[PDB]
Design a binder for this molecule. Sequence first.
Ligand code: HEM
Ligand SMILES: CNCc1ccc(-c2cccnc2)o1
Length: 465
Amino acid sequence: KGKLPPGPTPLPFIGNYLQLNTEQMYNSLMKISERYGPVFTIHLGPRRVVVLCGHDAVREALVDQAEEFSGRGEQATFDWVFKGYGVVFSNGERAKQLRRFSIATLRDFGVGKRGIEERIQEEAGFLIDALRGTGGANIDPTFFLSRTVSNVISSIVFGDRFDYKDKEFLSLLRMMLGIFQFTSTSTGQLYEMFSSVMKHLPGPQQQAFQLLQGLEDFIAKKVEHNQRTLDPNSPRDFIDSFLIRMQEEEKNPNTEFYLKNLVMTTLNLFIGGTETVSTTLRYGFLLLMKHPEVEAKVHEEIDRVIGKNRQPKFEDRAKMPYMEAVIHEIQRFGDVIPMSLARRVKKDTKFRDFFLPKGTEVYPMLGSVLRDPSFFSNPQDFNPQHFLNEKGQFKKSDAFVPFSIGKRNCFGEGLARMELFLFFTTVMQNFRLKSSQSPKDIDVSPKHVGFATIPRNYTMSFLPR
Ligand code: HEM
Ligand SMILES: CNCc1ccc(-c2cccnc2)o1
């Protein structure tokens, strides 16, 4: 054919706005795919975007033509602060250099190794102490979980953890929660279409911008402290490593290693390394309270494999198929980043006999893959059996793509999975979950869905086992 994928005809500037509901973008786009097919073009305001729905379309593009679909598209709210700098919301040689350096440096600091496993175990112990500190009282788990998650990546990028009583630490966590909520609301999705105008108007978007600025300013302050105390022969953390590479590159006019990329890359890892794991844990405990039979089976396996005295270790997962299946089902059901981070085609591309001109933005609808009816028998239900065969052994799925796939896939995936396993296991080993309502009345449908999937606010209690 040689034409862009079919789609509803757009109007000048507003694009397909009148055929979308900003409060429910995913549903709006899926409604349209019913009429046009799994691969279709939509106009988010002036942004022309090819939407990919279901497993086959997403994998054929992001993996079978991995290089062609390896550009990074926009996320207007985050782009407001990043401006194309840093490792996530960037492209070309910049993204390439920063990703290579970030992955290597994360490994140097223990990611994927015993060093970060010990760090996570230690922080998990501090979370158990905090939960015991509640005395079994009903509490909002939100910041108990995010403080613990954030301290892992914070130890790597800043060199040490934050005290749980640190007010400024709580402030930063509130900024992250607030920005993820904003991008998941109707105004946040309206902003993705009309940022050209909205960035200049009063409204919730200015408050989101100030939370991003608060975070950037905190990182800039940390980088400054590190600079005036730097030992080039003994780096303390990610920031020092990057500062050293910046010194070595000082005579290269075209280097990507300079201050703005240091601040933006560190900001990416601090926010990226905190919020999505935190949201996943929060959604996981809510699902476990909705499904007591699953919490019971989790407890049987933990008690049998690990017992009640020692701390869970990452190698325990190999002996724990039920917990592995439960964590996968929490990520599958939770669908925390439902439309991934947008990609962009690097060059003119032929895809399924459609034509995608260079620069065209792409929305890999991960949630549509996590719920693809060809891969999960009851995609709308929370059921760990989706990841187990008949003998209760763990069964992988090609449609398990919460970290996306391809050339710009999540490189925090290893750290995230180690955290999820160790925090869910260590919490469940030590506590049984007590809801403020009967399982039948617990609502696990999301509070907001846009850039992220945010669970409804709730309280619960952790009772020692
Ligand atoms: C439950 C946890 C997490 C989820 C669901 C998640 C998911 C994702 C997704 C969907 C993407 C976009 C991939 C693409 O464009 O195809 C991404 C990218 C990224 N993630 Fe994560 N992530 C998680 C945890 C982490 C952690 C712990 C870190 C940091 C240590 C992190 C760092 C990044 C970075 C730096 C990118 C950008 C990669 C690039 O542009 O080249 N993520 N993640
Ligand atoms: C968690 N991994 C991918 C992901 C989702 C949202 C973000 C993110 C948001 C703001 C700054 N840096 C990164 O990164």
